[PDB]
Amino acid sequence: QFAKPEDAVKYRQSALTLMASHFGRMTPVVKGQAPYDAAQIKANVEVLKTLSALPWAAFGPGTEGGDARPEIWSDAASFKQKQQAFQDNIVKLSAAADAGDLDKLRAAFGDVGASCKACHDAYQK
Amino acid sequence: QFAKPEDAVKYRQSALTLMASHFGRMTPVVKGQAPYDAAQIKANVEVLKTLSALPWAAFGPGTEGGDARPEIWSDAASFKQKQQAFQDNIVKLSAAADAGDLDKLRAAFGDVGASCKACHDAYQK
Numbered sequence: 001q002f003a004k005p006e007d008a009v010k011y012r013q014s015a016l017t018l019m020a021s022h023f024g025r026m027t028p029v030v031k032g033q034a035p036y037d038a039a040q041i042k043a044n045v046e047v048l049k050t051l052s053a054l055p056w057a058a059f060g061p062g063t064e065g066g067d068a069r070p071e072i073w074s075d076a077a078s079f080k081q082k083q084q085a086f087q088d089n090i091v092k093l094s095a096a097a098d099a100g101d102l103d104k105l106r107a108a109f110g111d112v113g114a115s116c117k118a119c120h121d122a123y124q125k
Numbered sequence: 126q127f128a129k130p131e132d133a134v135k136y137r138q139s140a141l142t143l144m145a146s147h148f149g150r151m152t153p154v155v156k157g158q159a160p161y162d163a164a165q166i167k168a169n170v171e172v173l174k175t176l177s178a179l180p181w182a183a184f185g186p187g188t189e190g191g192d193a194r195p196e197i198w199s200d201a202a203s204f205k206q207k208q209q210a211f212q213d214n215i216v217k218l219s220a221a222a223d224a225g226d227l228d229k230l231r232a233a234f235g236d237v238g239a240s241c242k243a244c245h246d247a248y249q250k
């Protein structure tokens with residue numbers, strides 16, 4: 001869907017920004033600093049689920065740029081493993097949200113955050 | 126969810142970028158220059174539905190900036206009318222996609238695009 005590699009960079013940066021806001025805005029809730037409304041969190045995690053699937057298709061062949069470390073395309077199976085582990089951790093977060101359980105939400109949120117950090121460490125300049 | 130107004134600007138720009146890619150990438154399909162796969166388009170419109178709901182909450186009080194024309198907050202009912210008409214046109218596009226009908230898709234796509242342009246004309250610097 002991208003006329004030039006810069007368009008893919010633009011897209012993935014935007015997706016990651018949006019995905020990130022939807023994750024991070026829950027931090028006060030998991031810490032107890034903001035109230036827990038199960039329906040609110042269910043709805044937000046549904047948004048995050050959708051967003052979480054979007055960046056990866058914008059690291060397609062020929063789309064080097066931005067802050068993507070070069071190690072993304074040359075180790076494609078390993079990068080995939082990574083987004084799929086993150087993507088699996090998101091499934092867990094959805095299950096916790098859909099079940100209305102703040103303890104399960106806290107644990108799932110932490111494992112998502114660890115997966116963000118793992119990919120960041122390997123693949124972000 | 127925004128610590129400073131700049132964060133809301135950042136978010137809405139990203140949402141609009143993403144929403145826009147999901148709309149615009151269908152242009153070759155509606156024109157017949159790319160093949161029509163009903164399932165592909167259904168899935169893409171589902172993404173666009175989710176995205177289409179996101180920008181508006183990031184024009185909250187105190188979030189002047191970016192290319193938002195000042196006329197957004199002082200005429201709040203009219204701006205709302207506008208996003209809700211766009212939002213209603215998106216419902217129509219979802220119905221066309223879910224029904225697998227390229228003629229209905231073409232018509233609905235055009236009315237969405239007109240609604241994008243209408244808000245752009247009134248409210249984007």
Ligand code: HEC
Pocket residue numbers: 009012013014016017019020023065066067068069079082083086112113115116117119120123124125
């Ligand atoms: C690899 C499988 C990743 C996972 C999982 C997550 N992120 Fe990431 N992120 C990744 C890359 C390779 C990049 C650079 C993209 C580019 O081309 O520049 C990023 C970037 C971000 C950004 C900055 C976006 C921008 O506006 O430029 C943010 C805010 C970000 N990532 C956040 C983030 C969060 C919160 C994640 C888990 C919920 C997450 N990322 C996962 C690679 C990967």
Ligand code: HEC
Pocket residue numbers: 134137138139141142144145148190191192193194204207208211237238240241242244245248249250
């Ligand atoms: C008002 C109800 C709008 C509708 C409907 C659409 N857009 Fe728009 N758009 C609007 C504003 C006020 C702005 C400026 C935001 C800011 O603070 O700068 C925009 C901006 C865009 C952009 C640029 C985003 C960026 O990266 O800076 C794009 C690509 C865009 N809008 C596209 C777009 C499309 C394709 C729409 C229909 C599918 C659409 N917008 C609707 C206001 C409104």
